[PDB]
Amino acid sequence: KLDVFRRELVDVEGIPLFWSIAEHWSQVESFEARPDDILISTYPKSGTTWVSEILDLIYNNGDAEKCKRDAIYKRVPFMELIIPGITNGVEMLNNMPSPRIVKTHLPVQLLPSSFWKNDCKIIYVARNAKDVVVSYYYFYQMAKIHPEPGTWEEFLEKFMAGQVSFGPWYDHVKSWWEKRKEYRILYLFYEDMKENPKCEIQKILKFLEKDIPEEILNKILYHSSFSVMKENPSANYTTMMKEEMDHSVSPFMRKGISGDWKNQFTVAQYEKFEEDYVKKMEDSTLKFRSE
Ligand SMILES: Nc1ncnc2c1ncn2[C@@H]1O[C@H](COP(=O)(O)OS(=O)(=O)O)[C@@H](OP(=O)(O)O)[C@H]1O
């Protein structure tokens, strides 16, 4: 009888989250981090899976077979994602041996304080807002834990208002940016990874204090490319129950480009978005590319 899908979001400290995360908030808030945890932190649809696969590849020295030991969401648990009878990110992590790779979409002010207290290395990934909202729309459609997104037009308005899962993109990226010097945060951009993935992976290795052979670097580059990941059942979310993710609605590995916003936004929608965007972002030193 209990339908866990398509419910309205429930606010935690003003941030709309899945009802089942809000229900289990004490478990998330009290999460016990470890000094050698690496946290992958992103606003939804910003490159989480890409960087997760990259990290697991680095940790397994480019061994593609070892990285097929399980689905990406088992290999790199989504910490706060808890759905009764289905999943519990905190429980999965509690029982995982170090070194753990941890996924989160929490804004800075909701991150379990144990990560700060343990001085964990954090890789944050940001992506231009317009591309994020396009990707998030199709994700809302296929990932049934989310509320119904409605029309593109309706969804875009909700996104601008921050009335979407994990709250406003604007606050999310800005506050993580502002935090970047306080803690061990590597702040990456999806568009940079698109333009020069080798450069970006090299930044990741230096941040992790890992040296690998050139051949292994090239292996990691290949296996983390969109075309390979899209065809990889261990990375493409096709192992999810259809009831949770319906890829016939929209595949998780959708396009993997920068600039798809130009295909989704009408000119009127774009003009309204940019006027709003400038107001919200003009006081931040953060700079994005959108193509
Ligand atoms: N390897 C690789 N290269 C390039 N792009 C990639 C890759 N893997 C995933 N993607 C694209 O990233 C979008 C998914 O974002 P996330 O992984 O952050 O989604 S989630 O928040 O974890 O659910 C989603 O973007 P869109 O294609 O624009 O929808 C994915 O297609």
Short mmCIF file of C-alpha atoms and ligand atoms in Angstrom, two decimals:
data_model
loop_
_atom_site.label_atom_id
_atom_site.label_comp_id
_atom_site.label_asym_id
_atom_site.label_seq_id
_atom_site.Cartn_x
_atom_site.Cartn_y
_atom_site.Cartn_z
CA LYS A 1 0.00 0.00 0.00
CA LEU A 2 2.81 2.47 0.87
CA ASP A 3 3.75 4.38 -2.30
CA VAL A 4 7.23 5.83 -1.80
CA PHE A 5 7.37 7.50 -5.25
CA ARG A 6 6.12 10.80 -6.72
CA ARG A 7 5.51 12.43 -3.32
CA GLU A 8 5.83 16.10 -2.52
CA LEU A 9 9.20 17.11 -1.11
CA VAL A 10 9.64 17.77 2.62
CA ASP A 11 11.76 20.70 3.82
CA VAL A 12 14.76 20.16 6.09
CA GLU A 13 15.88 23.57 7.38
CA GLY A 14 14.19 25.15 4.34
CA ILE A 15 15.68 22.73 1.78
CA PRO A 16 13.21 20.50 -0.08
CA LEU A 17 14.33 16.89 0.23
CA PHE A 18 12.73 13.50 -0.49
CA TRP A 19 10.19 12.64 2.23
CA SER A 20 12.18 9.57 3.25
CA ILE A 21 15.40 11.56 3.70
CA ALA A 22 13.54 14.10 5.87
CA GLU A 23 12.08 11.19 7.89
CA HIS A 24 15.58 9.82 8.56
CA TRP A 25 17.28 13.15 9.03
CA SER A 26 18.79 12.29 12.42
CA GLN A 27 20.68 9.38 10.76
CA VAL A 28 22.14 11.70 8.11
CA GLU A 29 22.97 14.53 10.50
CA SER A 30 24.80 12.17 12.85
CA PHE A 31 26.74 10.49 10.02
CA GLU A 32 30.15 9.33 11.12
CA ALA A 33 32.79 10.31 8.58
CA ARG A 34 36.38 9.00 8.59
CA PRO A 35 39.63 10.92 7.99
CA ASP A 36 40.31 9.17 4.67
CA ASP A 37 36.79 9.42 3.22
CA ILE A 38 36.72 11.25 -0.11
CA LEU A 39 33.47 13.14 -0.53
CA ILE A 40 32.08 13.83 -4.00
CA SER A 41 29.73 16.75 -3.54
CA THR A 42 27.51 18.26 -6.24
CA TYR A 43 24.26 19.95 -6.97
CA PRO A 44 22.20 17.32 -8.86
CA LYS A 45 23.09 16.72 -12.52
CA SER A 46 26.48 18.43 -12.32
CA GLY A 47 28.82 15.49 -13.02
CA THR A 48 28.45 13.29 -9.93
CA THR A 49 28.49 9.92 -11.73
CA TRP A 50 31.32 11.03 -14.03
CA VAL A 51 33.61 11.96 -11.16
CA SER A 52 32.47 8.95 -9.05
CA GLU A 53 33.47 6.58 -11.86
CA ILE A 54 36.79 8.47 -12.27
CA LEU A 55 37.56 8.07 -8.55
CA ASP A 56 36.64 4.40 -8.42
CA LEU A 57 38.86 3.87 -11.48
CA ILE A 58 41.77 5.70 -9.78
CA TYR A 59 41.23 3.63 -6.61
CA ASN A 60 41.29 0.42 -8.67
CA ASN A 61 44.30 1.50 -10.75
CA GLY A 62 42.31 1.66 -14.00
CA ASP A 63 40.98 -1.91 -13.63
CA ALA A 64 37.72 -1.70 -15.58
CA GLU A 65 36.70 -5.19 -14.47
CA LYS A 66 37.09 -4.39 -10.76
CA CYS A 67 34.96 -1.31 -11.37
CA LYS A 68 32.22 -3.64 -12.66
CA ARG A 69 32.05 -5.43 -9.29
CA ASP A 70 28.76 -3.59 -8.68
CA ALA A 71 26.56 -0.70 -9.82
CA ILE A 72 28.05 2.79 -9.31
CA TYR A 73 25.47 3.55 -6.62
CA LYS A 74 26.65 0.54 -4.59
CA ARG A 75 30.34 1.30 -5.23
CA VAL A 76 29.97 4.97 -4.32
CA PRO A 77 26.98 5.24 -1.96
CA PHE A 78 24.61 8.21 -2.15
CA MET A 79 24.92 9.04 1.58
CA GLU A 80 21.67 10.82 2.38
CA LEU A 81 19.48 8.75 0.05
CA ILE A 82 17.28 6.62 2.28
CA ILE A 83 14.08 4.97 1.02
CA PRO A 84 12.36 2.45 3.31
CA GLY A 85 12.54 -1.13 2.00
CA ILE A 86 14.75 0.01 -0.88
CA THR A 87 17.99 1.72 0.15
CA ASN A 88 19.89 3.39 2.98
CA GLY A 89 23.05 5.28 2.05
CA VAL A 90 24.18 5.74 5.67
CA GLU A 91 23.83 2.01 6.48
CA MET A 92 25.72 1.08 3.29
CA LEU A 93 28.55 3.45 4.25
CA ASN A 94 28.64 2.39 7.93
CA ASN A 95 29.45 -1.14 6.76
CA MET A 96 31.96 -0.21 4.05
CA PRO A 97 35.72 -0.55 4.61
CA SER A 98 37.97 2.46 4.16
CA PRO A 99 38.95 4.22 2.00
CA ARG A 100 35.33 5.18 1.26
CA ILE A 101 34.16 7.27 -1.68
CA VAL A 102 30.97 9.08 -0.64
CA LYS A 103 28.36 10.83 -2.83
CA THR A 104 26.25 13.75 -1.55
CA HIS A 105 24.09 16.54 -2.96
CA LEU A 106 23.70 18.34 0.37
CA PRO A 107 24.23 22.09 0.51
CA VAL A 108 27.07 23.20 2.81
CA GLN A 109 24.80 24.06 5.74
CA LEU A 110 23.26 20.55 5.74
CA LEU A 111 26.45 18.49 5.36
CA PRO A 112 26.93 16.20 8.37
CA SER A 113 29.39 18.07 10.60
CA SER A 114 31.59 14.96 10.96
CA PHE A 115 33.08 15.70 7.52
CA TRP A 116 34.41 19.06 8.73
CA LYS A 117 35.56 17.62 12.08
CA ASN A 118 37.46 14.87 10.24
CA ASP A 119 38.98 17.34 7.74
CA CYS A 120 37.88 15.13 4.82
CA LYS A 121 39.00 15.85 1.27
CA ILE A 122 36.02 16.98 -0.77
CA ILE A 123 35.70 17.14 -4.55
CA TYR A 124 32.95 19.58 -5.49
CA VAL A 125 31.68 19.68 -9.08
CA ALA A 126 29.67 22.57 -10.54
CA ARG A 127 27.96 22.84 -13.92
CA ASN A 128 26.38 25.84 -15.63
CA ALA A 129 22.84 26.47 -14.34
CA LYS A 130 21.05 26.28 -17.70
CA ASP A 131 22.51 22.86 -18.55
CA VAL A 132 21.75 21.69 -15.01
CA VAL A 133 18.06 22.60 -15.21
CA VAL A 134 17.66 20.83 -18.58
CA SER A 135 19.34 17.67 -17.26
CA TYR A 136 17.32 17.90 -14.02
CA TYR A 137 14.01 18.13 -15.89
CA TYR A 138 14.54 14.85 -17.72
CA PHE A 139 15.89 13.30 -14.52
CA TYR A 140 12.70 14.32 -12.64
CA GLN A 141 10.71 12.57 -15.38
CA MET A 142 12.58 9.24 -15.22
CA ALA A 143 13.58 9.07 -11.51
CA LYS A 144 10.26 8.37 -9.79
CA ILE A 145 11.34 9.34 -6.25
CA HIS A 146 10.95 12.98 -7.44
CA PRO A 147 7.62 14.82 -7.56
CA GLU A 148 6.03 15.13 -11.01
CA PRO A 149 7.98 17.88 -12.77
CA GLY A 150 5.07 19.04 -14.95
CA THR A 151 5.87 20.92 -18.16
CA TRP A 152 9.37 22.18 -18.99
CA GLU A 153 8.01 25.69 -18.48
CA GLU A 154 6.64 24.82 -15.01
CA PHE A 155 9.83 23.01 -14.03
CA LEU A 156 12.09 25.87 -15.14
CA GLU A 157 10.09 28.22 -12.91
CA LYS A 158 10.43 25.85 -9.93
CA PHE A 159 14.16 25.55 -10.56
CA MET A 160 14.53 29.34 -10.63
CA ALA A 161 12.56 29.50 -7.37
CA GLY A 162 14.70 26.76 -5.76
CA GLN A 163 11.57 24.65 -5.28
CA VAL A 164 13.28 21.45 -6.43
CA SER A 165 15.01 18.55 -4.68
CA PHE A 166 18.12 19.82 -2.80
CA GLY A 167 17.01 23.45 -3.05
CA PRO A 168 18.37 26.34 -5.14
CA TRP A 169 21.30 25.75 -7.46
CA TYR A 170 22.40 29.37 -6.87
CA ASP A 171 22.87 29.05 -3.10
CA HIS A 172 24.32 25.55 -3.49
CA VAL A 173 27.22 26.46 -5.81
CA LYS A 174 27.91 29.86 -4.20
CA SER A 175 28.15 28.57 -0.61
CA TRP A 176 30.37 25.66 -1.59
CA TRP A 177 32.55 28.14 -3.50
CA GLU A 178 32.78 30.42 -0.44
CA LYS A 179 33.80 27.40 1.68
CA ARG A 180 36.56 26.27 -0.70
CA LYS A 181 39.50 27.85 1.13
CA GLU A 182 38.31 26.87 4.64
CA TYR A 183 38.54 23.15 3.96
CA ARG A 184 40.27 20.68 1.66
CA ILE A 185 37.97 21.27 -1.30
CA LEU A 186 38.81 20.73 -4.96
CA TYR A 187 36.26 22.81 -6.85
CA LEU A 188 35.80 21.49 -10.39
CA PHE A 189 33.63 22.46 -13.35
CA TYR A 190 31.80 20.06 -15.66
CA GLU A 191 32.64 22.30 -18.64
CA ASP A 192 36.40 22.02 -17.89
CA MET A 193 36.07 18.22 -17.74
CA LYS A 194 34.34 18.38 -21.12
CA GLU A 195 37.05 20.56 -22.67
CA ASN A 196 40.10 18.86 -21.21
CA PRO A 197 39.37 15.73 -19.16
CA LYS A 198 43.09 14.90 -18.89
CA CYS A 199 43.85 18.24 -17.26
CA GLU A 200 41.00 17.76 -14.80
CA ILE A 201 41.87 14.17 -13.88
CA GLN A 202 45.46 15.32 -13.31
CA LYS A 203 44.12 17.95 -10.88
CA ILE A 204 42.21 15.15 -9.10
CA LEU A 205 45.33 12.96 -8.83
CA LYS A 206 47.42 15.84 -7.44
CA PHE A 207 44.64 16.63 -4.93
CA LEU A 208 44.56 12.95 -3.90
CA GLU A 209 48.39 12.84 -3.72
CA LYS A 210 48.42 9.87 -6.11
CA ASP A 211 50.88 9.22 -8.91
CA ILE A 212 49.87 6.77 -11.65
CA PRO A 213 51.53 5.68 -14.92
CA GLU A 214 50.56 7.44 -18.17
CA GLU A 215 49.02 4.20 -19.48
CA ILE A 216 46.76 4.03 -16.41
CA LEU A 217 45.82 7.70 -16.85
CA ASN A 218 44.81 6.94 -20.45
CA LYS A 219 42.81 3.89 -19.28
CA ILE A 220 40.95 6.03 -16.75
CA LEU A 221 40.27 8.66 -19.40
CA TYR A 222 38.83 6.02 -21.75
CA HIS A 223 36.64 4.21 -19.22
CA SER A 224 35.23 7.45 -17.83
CA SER A 225 34.28 8.83 -21.27
CA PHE A 226 30.57 9.33 -21.90
CA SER A 227 30.30 6.75 -24.70
CA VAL A 228 31.90 4.03 -22.58
CA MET A 229 29.98 4.93 -19.43
CA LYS A 230 26.67 5.03 -21.34
CA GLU A 231 27.19 1.42 -22.50
CA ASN A 232 28.41 0.23 -19.10
CA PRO A 233 25.59 -1.37 -17.07
CA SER A 234 27.71 -0.86 -13.92
CA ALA A 235 27.76 2.92 -14.47
CA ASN A 236 24.60 3.83 -16.42
CA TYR A 237 21.90 3.22 -13.79
CA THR A 238 20.13 0.56 -15.92
CA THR A 239 20.41 -1.84 -12.95
CA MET A 240 17.81 0.25 -11.04
CA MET A 241 14.28 -1.17 -10.76
CA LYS A 242 12.06 0.35 -13.44
CA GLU A 243 9.77 1.52 -10.58
CA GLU A 244 12.65 3.71 -9.36
CA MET A 245 14.17 4.75 -12.72
CA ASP A 246 12.45 4.33 -16.08
CA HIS A 247 15.10 4.77 -18.81
CA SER A 248 12.42 4.55 -21.52
CA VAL A 249 11.21 7.94 -20.24
CA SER A 250 14.74 9.37 -20.40
CA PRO A 251 18.06 7.55 -20.07
CA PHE A 252 20.30 8.56 -17.16
CA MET A 253 23.21 8.90 -19.57
CA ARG A 254 21.29 11.34 -21.70
CA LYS A 255 23.53 13.52 -23.92
CA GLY A 256 26.66 14.37 -21.88
CA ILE A 257 27.37 17.69 -23.60
CA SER A 258 27.68 21.32 -22.61
CA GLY A 259 25.19 23.65 -24.31
CA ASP A 260 22.04 21.48 -24.51
CA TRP A 261 20.25 24.43 -22.91
CA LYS A 262 20.15 26.06 -26.37
CA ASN A 263 17.90 23.19 -27.52
CA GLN A 264 15.54 23.34 -24.54
CA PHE A 265 15.10 27.05 -23.75
CA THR A 266 12.94 29.29 -25.87
CA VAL A 267 14.44 32.74 -26.42
CA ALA A 268 11.86 34.22 -24.02
CA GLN A 269 12.71 31.60 -21.36
CA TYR A 270 16.42 32.29 -21.77
CA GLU A 271 15.99 36.08 -21.44
CA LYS A 272 13.94 35.67 -18.26
CA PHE A 273 16.45 33.18 -16.85
CA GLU A 274 19.52 35.41 -17.45
CA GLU A 275 17.88 38.49 -15.94
CA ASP A 276 17.11 36.44 -12.82
CA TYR A 277 20.55 34.76 -12.85
CA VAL A 278 22.55 38.01 -12.96
CA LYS A 279 20.77 39.33 -9.86
CA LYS A 280 21.42 36.13 -7.91
CA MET A 281 25.06 35.67 -8.98
CA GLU A 282 26.54 39.18 -9.51
CA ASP A 283 28.11 39.38 -6.02
CA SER A 284 29.89 35.99 -6.42
CA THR A 285 33.38 35.61 -7.95
CA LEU A 286 32.25 32.29 -9.45
CA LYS A 287 32.43 32.16 -13.28
CA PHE A 288 30.74 29.59 -15.54
CA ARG A 289 30.86 28.74 -19.24
CA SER A 290 27.60 27.57 -20.84
CA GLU A 291 28.89 26.01 -24.10
N1 LIG B 1 31.33 10.41 -18.57
C1 LIG B 1 30.49 11.45 -18.75
N2 LIG B 1 30.81 12.48 -19.55
C2 LIG B 1 29.99 13.53 -19.76
N3 LIG B 1 28.79 13.66 -19.16
C3 LIG B 1 28.34 12.69 -18.33
C4 LIG B 1 29.18 11.51 -18.06
N4 LIG B 1 28.50 10.73 -17.20
C5 LIG B 1 27.32 11.35 -16.94
N5 LIG B 1 27.24 12.51 -17.61
C6 LIG B 1 26.13 13.49 -17.62
O1 LIG B 1 25.99 14.17 -16.37
C7 LIG B 1 24.61 14.33 -16.06
C8 LIG B 1 24.28 13.45 -14.88
O2 LIG B 1 24.71 14.21 -13.75
P1 LIG B 1 24.92 13.51 -12.33
O3 LIG B 1 25.78 12.30 -12.53
O4 LIG B 1 25.42 14.57 -11.39
O5 LIG B 1 23.43 13.10 -11.95
S1 LIG B 1 23.05 12.82 -10.39
O6 LIG B 1 22.83 14.09 -9.67
O7 LIG B 1 24.09 12.01 -9.70
O8 LIG B 1 21.79 12.03 -10.43
C9 LIG B 1 23.84 13.90 -17.30
O9 LIG B 1 23.85 15.06 -18.12
P2 LIG B 1 22.81 15.33 -19.32
O10 LIG B 1 23.27 14.40 -20.42
O11 LIG B 1 23.07 16.75 -19.70
O12 LIG B 1 21.42 15.05 -18.78
C10 LIG B 1 24.78 12.84 -17.86
O13 LIG B 1 24.55 12.53 -19.24
#
